[PDB]
Structure formats: C-alpha cells, structure tokens
From a paper:
Educt molecules are knob-into-hole heterodimers of one half-antibody-like productive side and one knob or hole dummy Fc. The dummy associates with the knob or hole Fc of the productive side (covalently linked by hinge interchain disulfides) and thereby covers the CH3 interface.
The implemented changes include reverting in CH3 Cys354 and Cys349 (KiH interchain disulfide) back to the parent residues Ser354 and Tyr 349 on dummy knob and dummy hole, respectively. Thus, Fc-dummy heterodimers are flawed in that region because Cys354 and Cys349 on the productive sides are loose ends, not paired with their respective Cys counterparts as they are missing in dummy chains. These residues constitute an interchain salt bridge in regular CH3. The charge flip partially destabilizes the CH3 interface by replacing the 357–370 Glu-Lys salt bridge with equally charged and hence repulsive Lys-Lys or Glu-Glu pairs at those positions. The reaction resolves the flawed CH3-educt interfaces to perfect complementarity in the products of the exchange reaction.
Numbering used by the authors:
A (entry chain B): 237 to 266, 274 to 354, 360 to 444
B (entry chain A): 237 to 443
The structure:
C-alpha cells in the first residue's frame, strides 16, 4: 500500500511576506488534488521521483500558500490518487487553533576558551517560532535551539544556546538573539547581549 | 500479523544500584487464530533464561498483547551490552527480532550551570530559574529540582539536543513565586548521568 504524509510550512516562511511558505505532501511506498477549506486549487507542483534503497519511489507534491491563509487557520487537504490502493488517501493540515500569545524573550549571560550565551523564550502560542543569532548585524553559526516544550499553562517555551570565543565576549561585542513569531509586532523581536 | 516494540530501562534505574532496570518486549496485534507467542532473549547474542513473560491479555480491538520483561544488571547496561528479543508466532513468516542497547560512543561528563531570573521577570509574581546542562553523552539523563531537601514539582525540562560537537545539552525551567525567591531561599538543580561521579551532581542558586 502507498503512504501519505503532509507537512506544514516552515515558521519563518509564513511570518515574512518576502519568503514563500509551502505545504508539502510526501508519498512513500510506490496524481494529487489540493483544497484550501472547500475550494480546489491548482498551483501545486510535483517533483522528480526520488527512488529509494528499498525499491520505493518517493513522490513529493509542493503547494505554495498565502501567509495570511495559513495564519488565519485555513485548512489544507492533499488527496493522493493512485492505482496501488483503492480509495484515494486524504491527509489534512492547518495551523494549531487558539489565541496566539507573544513570546517573552530574555538573554542570559555566562556563568574555558568559550562561553555559552543563552536566549530563553517563553509563554508563546502556537509553537511555530524561529530563533537566530547575530553580531554586528552579521549571522552567527555556532548556535543550537531546543524544540518548543509545552509549559504547564498551555504556552510553549524553548532556549537557544550560542557558543562564541571567550575573547569576542571579552572585548564586549554585542550579541543579538532574534525571535520571529506571529504574535509579535511585525512578527519579530530582538534582545541584546554583552558583558557588564 | 503481530508487531514488536522493545523499550529500554529508564535512565535513573541503571544509575542507582537500589533501583531495578528492565528491558521490556511488547507484542501487539496477536490474532485469535494464532495466539501463542514465544519469546527468546539474548544478551550480546547469548541466550538467557530469566525473563518473566506475562499471560496474554485481550485488547478491546480483540487482538492480544503479550509482554516479556528482562531484568538487566546495571553494569551490563552501562558496559553497552545488547539485548535482543525474538518473538515467534505461528502467523509470522519468520520470528521478529529487535535489539536495544545504550547509545554507542565515549561517555562525557555533564556540565551543570544555574542561571538566575532576569530583572524584568521581577514584575510578575513568578520567577523562572534556569539549569543548563551541556556536553553530556550519551543522552540518557535525569534532571530534578529541590529546596530544603524537598522536591519542587513546578519545572519543565527540554529533550536533550544534539550539539555540534556530538555531545548533548538541555535546559530545565523551574517556576517559583517571586517571594520565595526574594526571602533568599536556595534552589537546587540535580542531575543524574553515567559520566558523573556517583552518577549524580547538584547545583544551587539563590539571590
Ligand atoms: C522505504 O524507505 C523509504 C524512504 O526512507 C528513507 O530512505 C531510504 C533510502 C532509507 O535510508 C530509509 O531508512 C530512509 O528513512 C521510507 O519512507 C519513510 O516511510 C515512513 C513510514 O511510511 C515515513 O514515516 C513518517 O515519518 C514522519 C516524519 O517524516 C519527516 O521527518 C523525517 C526526518 O526524520 C524524514 O525522513 C521525512 O522525509 C520527513 O521529513 C520532512 O519532510 C518534509 C517534506 O518536505 C519537510 O517539510 C517541508 O520542508 C521544506 C524544506 O525542504 C519546506 O520548509 C516546506 O515548507 C516544508 O513543508 C520537513 O521539514 C522534513 N522534516 C525534516 C526536517 O526532516 C512522521 O511524522 C510520521 O510519524 C507519524 O505517524 C506515524 C505513523 O507512521 C506514527 O508512528 C507517529 O506517532 C506520527 O504521528 C511517519 O511515520 C518516513 O518519514 C519516510 N521517510 C521519508 C524520507 O519520507 C519507506 O517507508 C520505506 N518503505 C517501507 C514501508 O518499507
Ligand atoms: C489494537 O489495540 C492495541 C493495544 O492498544 C490499547 O488498546 C486499544 C484497543 C486502544 O484502546 C488503545 O487506547 C490502547 O493503548 C494497539 O497496540 C498499540 O500498537 C501501536 C502500534 O500499532 C503501538 O504504537 C507504538 O507505541 C510506542 C510508544 O509505546 C509506549 O507509549 C504509549 C503511550 O504513548 C503506550 O501506550 C505504550 O504502552 C508504550 O508505553 C510504554 O510502555 C513501556 C513498556 O512497558 C514502558 O517501558 C517500561 O516502563 C517501566 C515502568 O512502567 C520501566 O521503567 C521499564 O524498564 C520500561 O521498559 C514505558 O514507560 C511506557 N511509556 C509510556 C509513554 O507510557 C512507540 O514507540 C512506537 O513508535 C515507534 O514505532 C513506530 C512504528 O510504529 C515509529 O513510528 C516510531 O518512529 C518509533 O520507532 C509505536 O507508536 C502501541 O504501543 C500499542 N499500544 C500498546 C498498549 O501497546 C494496536 O495498535 C491496536 N491494533 C489495531 C489493529 O488497531
């Protein structure tokens, strides 16, 4: 039997009008219809088959979606037709339902040749969020962010850890944690870090 | 046909000689027509004979589920031995095997740091105390909080996250009333992991 998975756009893509958010309908184990709420839609695009180490083909259909539709909770339905199973499989997907809540951002200074800078982001809803670090308006590359964790009041939290040379912290370059979320003004805040 | 799921001990069970660690082999979707289930267990490929298999139990979907439990020695688990469960049922073309063991790689000692609440979280009447734990391997770990020898239940802990040098980190958030914080009470983050001495460290924080 063929098997259908359906994936949401990336958080960052929906929050910035410049980027193009996509809903992806993956099919493992070998047609495509798309609806947004009721309405049938056409702009979807299939991909070159990606054969597998287990005699599987992986066929992927990508539909581009409007930022505002996704944010407003519209529902995306991927009806996969084929021969190797009778009834056309449906999957469906939409943004998590509920009042979006604004992340609260707080940077925390270190307690070797390297120090760990922390950015704790709490109290936000839905869990869709993107975190990034920069210095002198330049992107950092030595950072990792935990997945969102469900807090006891139903909001989410996470922490981002940025690792830099003890020396850069030393002079007092300023380090900046960017956070993007639907509940923030312009979908974007920043908190700032350096030593005192 | 049937399905097999094999589950490891909890981290805390292998790290404390007082607790008893177990590996658990669960078979579901056993049919009525072919209800007998046989388990064979192997440690590092050598058959063992002390597992305890429970009587089959009918589910509401009218399939059976059968469970076999094998107690493991703390040190076998920490020495990376491999536990295999082989399940035989007359509906299967061949027996199902699953194997499990501690994640492979050289253990690394966790570094535990506490981080106090920020100033600006001192307008609400709750504060957030932070216990960063990084540089550990493998990812099996247990993190808890206490004050005055009593556990603090109001905390949440991230899953271990794969760091870029191959170790793991996580943070734990403890939420307390701002008062308790300001009276200058002492909060304790406690961490259990194989690469710690006595498998257990403890870091404190207050004003
Ligand atoms: C034969 O093998 C194939 C292929 O498998 C791989 O390739 C071969 C060569 C071997 O090496 C395999 O071992 C490899 O795995 C098998 O295909 C697999 O089948 C699985 C079962 O049918 C299927 O299970 C489901 O997994 C879901 C998660 O899928 C995610 O995440 C994993 C990463 O861990 C990844 O493998 C998948 O591709 C998929 O990854 C996401 O892809 C989407 C789509 O593009 C990304 O989203 C988009 O990203 C773009 C940017 O690129 C853009 O941002 C778009 O906006 C955005 O939409 C997304 O970001 C990717 N994630 C990342 C970062 O990795 C699980 O959710 C799910 O579990 C759920 O349901 C289960 C029931 O099955 C429950 O158990 C569970 O609780 C959950 O509810 C599914 O189980 C595998 O994903 C699939 N692997 C792939 C590669 O597709 C095939 O099965 C096998 N045949 C058999 C049956 O023998
Ligand atoms: C017919 O019904 C059966 C039985 O189900 C119940 O009855 C039915 C009628 C319904 O009413 C249900 O509500 C009931 O649950 C169905 O059987 C299910 O099959 C599923 C696959 O079809 C299988 O899914 C897999 O589950 C794994 C998670 O299992 C955990 O977690 C869930 C809760 O999330 C839990 O329900 C399971 O019981 C199991 O719980 C763990 O139990 C272990 C073993 O005892 C515990 O381990 C021990 O713990 C003790 C202390 O207790 C000690 O510390 C020991 O040392 C230690 O070993 C552990 O603590 C428990 N954890 C939790 C969370 O409680 C998933 O891992 C797994 O995912 C993996 O496999 C996937 C492929 O399937 C991949 O996608 C994935 O990437 C992973 O690799 C599967 O999702 C269900 O577990 C199973 N339910 C039960 C009860 O076994 C049956 O499916 C249905 N049949 C039909 C035809 O409908």
């Amino acid at each position: 039997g063929p098997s259908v998975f359906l994936f949401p756009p990336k958080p960052k893509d929906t929050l910035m009008i410049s980027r193009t958010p996509e809903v992806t309908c993956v099919v493992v184990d070998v047609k495509f219809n798309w609806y947004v709420d009721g309405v049938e839609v056409h702009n979807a695009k299939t991909k070159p088959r990606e054969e597998q180490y287990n005699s599987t083909y992986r066929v992927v259909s990508v539909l581009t979606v409007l930022h505002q539709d996704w944010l407003n909770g519209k529902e995306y339905k991927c009806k996969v037709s084929n021969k190797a199973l009778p009834a056309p499989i449906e999957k469906t997907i939409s943004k998590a339902k509920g009042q979006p809540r604004e992340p609260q951002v707080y940077t925390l200074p270190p307690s070797k040749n390297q120090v760990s800078l922390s950015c704790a982001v709490k109290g936000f809803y839905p869990s869709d969020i993107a975190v990034e670090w920069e210095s002198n308006g330049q992107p950092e590359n030595n950072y990792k962010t935990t997945p969102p964790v469900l807090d006891s009041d139903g909001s989410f939290f996470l922490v981002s850890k940025l690792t830099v040379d003890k020396s850069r912290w030393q002079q007092g370059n300023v380090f900046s944690c960017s956070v993007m979320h639907e509940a923030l003004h312009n979908h974007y805040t920043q908190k700032s870090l350096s030593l005192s």
